[PDB]
From a paper:
PP2A predominantly exists as either a core dimeric complex consisting of the scaffolding A subunit and the catalytic C subunit, or a heterotrimeric holoenzyme that contains the AC core complex and a regulatory/targeting B subunit. In particular, the B56 subfamily of PP2A localizes to the kinetochores/centromeres of unattached chromosomes through the interaction between the B56 subunit and BubR1. The multi-domain pseudokinase BubR1 is a central component of the SAC and promotes chromosome congression at the kinetochore. It has been shown that a so-called ‘kinetochore attachment and regulatory domain’ (KARD) domain in the middle of BubR1 sequence is required for PP2A-B56 binding. Here we present the crystal structure of a B56-BubR1 complex, which reveals the molecular basis of PP2A recruitment by BubR1 to the kinetochore.
To provide the structural basis for understanding how PP2A is recruited to the kinetochore through its interaction with BubR1, we determined the crystal structure of human PP2A B56γ1(30–380) in complex with human BubR1(647–720)-3D at 2.35 resolution. Similar to the corresponding B56 structures alone and in the PP2A holoenzyme, B56γ1 in our complex contains seven and half HEAT repeats and forms a solenoid shape. There are two B56γ1-BubR1 complexes in each asymmetric unit, with almost identical structures (r.m.s.d. of 0.277 Å for 2281 non-hydrogen atoms). Although BubR1(647–720)-3D contains 74 residues, we were only able to visualize electron densities for 8 residues in a groove formed between the HEAT repeats 3 and 4. When our B56γ1-BubR1 complex structure is superimposed on that of the A-B56γ1-C PP2A trimeric holoenzyme, it is clear that the visible BubR1 segment is located in the B56 surface groove that is opposite to the face that interacts with the PP2A catalytic C subunit. Therefore BubR1 should not affect PP2A enzymatic activity and should not interfere with the PP2A holoenzyme assembly. Among these eight BubR1 residues visible in the electron density map, four residues (Lys668, Leu669, Ile672 and Glu674) form sidechain-mediated interactions with B56γ1. Leu669 resides in a pocket formed by B56γ1 sidechains of His187, Ser173, Ile227, Thr184 and Glu226; whereas the sidechain of BubR1 Ile672 is located in a hydrophobic pocket formed by B56γ1 residues His187, Ile231, Tyr190 and Ser230. The carboxyl group of BubR1 Glu674 settles in a positively charged pocket, and its sidechain forms hydrogen bonds with B56 His243 sidechain and the mainchain amine group of B56 Ala236, respectively. Among the three potential BubR1 KARD domain phosphorylation sites (Ser670, Ser676 and Thr680), only Ser670 is within the visible KLS670PIIED segment. It was surprising that the sidechain of Asp670 that mimics the phosphoserine face solvent and does not make significant contact with B56γ1.
Numbering used by the authors:
A (entry chain A): 29 to 109, 124 to 375
B (entry chain C): 668 to 675
Write the structure that this text describes.
Amino acid sequence: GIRDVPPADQEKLFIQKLRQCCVLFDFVSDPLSDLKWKEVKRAALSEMVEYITHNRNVITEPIYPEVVHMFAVNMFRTLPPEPTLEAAWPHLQLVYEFFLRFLESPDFQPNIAKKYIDQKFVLQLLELFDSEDPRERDFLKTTLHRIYGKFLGLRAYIRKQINNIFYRFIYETEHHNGIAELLEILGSIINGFALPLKEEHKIFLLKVLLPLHKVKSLSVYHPQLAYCVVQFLEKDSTLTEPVVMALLKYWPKTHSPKEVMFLNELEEILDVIEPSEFVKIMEPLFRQLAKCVSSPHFQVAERALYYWNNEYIMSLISDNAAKILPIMFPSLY
Amino acid sequence: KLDPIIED
């Protein structure tokens, strides 16, 4: 290991390995090519992971630019046009692992690192969320979460650029492989919002999160989206009417199994709803619920019927029985 | 899974 040469020589050798790992190998054209050198690079990456994991005061000031340059050269690249996996994963996996341990080390000083981990770095990182490889997206997700946490100065930039990605997805391409992972990061951020909610965030709910419900591939990221929406209503109950009315607007207009995820989101909203907000939206909500109960899709009908077994929802229905019963049972009440 | 991040 690096640990086994004299302490005077260790930084030099560490830098030397980081630079060797800037050599890039092709795993696609000829997959049996250069196996000896590929292994040399894998072992060097693995050695550097161990070295920063098991030693202290080894991330010195000259290490920072070398680490960031090594990451960039390996990771910032044009992406190709069940899932398609990244053939270079045997190396990229270890670069992600090492960079993560770099960020999480007790030696790590954000006041030094911020000179190299900047808006440009975050821009290029965020482009990689469109990777087809779910393992890459998973490492990216964790990495960006760590960066957002440790770099206060980058937080506004990260939020804005995720919004740019979301806007292009909604209004242009309707195709992006990592919406779910980005919403997962946003969920953790929304949960930490202070009160009262900044106007920036309410705009983000109303202009970004709600319109995400209209994109045809919604089912891929819907659980993560619902979680973000519910967190907003736990923070500020006065946003209930615009959220519920928008959800009702985006509700499928043919009977569909996709209504199941809409019923899930809506029940999760009702679980945190205030009685006075409930009365505002109960009539349109239960008109939709009545249609779902009568759905010719068995799973939709059953799913809607379960609302009656939610004790809290039933207490709200029962306190407003005179207005809700005639909607749920027109030929009776 | 991801820990909350407190606004600051």
